[PDB]
Amino acid sequence: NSLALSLTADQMVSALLDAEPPILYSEYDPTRPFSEASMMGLLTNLADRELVHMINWAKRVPGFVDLTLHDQVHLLECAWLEILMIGLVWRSMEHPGKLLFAPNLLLDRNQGKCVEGMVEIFDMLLATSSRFRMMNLQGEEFVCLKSIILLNSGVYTFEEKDHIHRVLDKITDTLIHLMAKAGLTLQQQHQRLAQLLLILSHIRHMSNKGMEHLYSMKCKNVVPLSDLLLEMLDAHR
């Protein structure tokens, strides 16, 4: 029996909020990246450090620790880029037209154009960001969504499955709880719930497109990829 299912809605929220990874910085340098090398250099370095925080974050997601080590590995291998991207989109919410990879690294689509096949992904991220903004997405909602991605994205590529789906149900309850607390009507609740979960389909799309692009520069040998990033990437092929 998992502790996750015995948690109340507010306990679930507080657990996720406190498990939140910090916002990392990129290297301090006013040199705005335009070359493919320098931009991807800054992005890989950042992604690599964020991955270590993500791993220790995932272990603090209720129900994740009850999974076998292998299942934990599979879910992270499947979801990591989605988790990075929705984080990026969340951080960039209050910066319209901008992507806040780090507080000292604000990228616009003009810089995305300066790598081949990147601007389309930039535009999708920017659209998701403005979408988050027009919905007035809250932090409590954000952490629920990120947890959903972690548990859902690799669940159909597998009784620990029923466990994941019970935990998934628990998060749904938590999302509804947050909307009820925010004063939303019953109709507004299931409409907003649906709106949030449909964006996950787009997040999945961006991750898949990104994964293709990362495989290219990996085969290109453009930019130095760490062994950890290489292993996460190989899991998708």
Partner: peptide, 10 residues
């Protein structure tokens, strides 16, 4: 033997 295997333990 994956790095992720090790990182999920520490």
């Amino acid at each position: 033997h994956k790095i992720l295997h090790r990182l999920l333990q520490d």
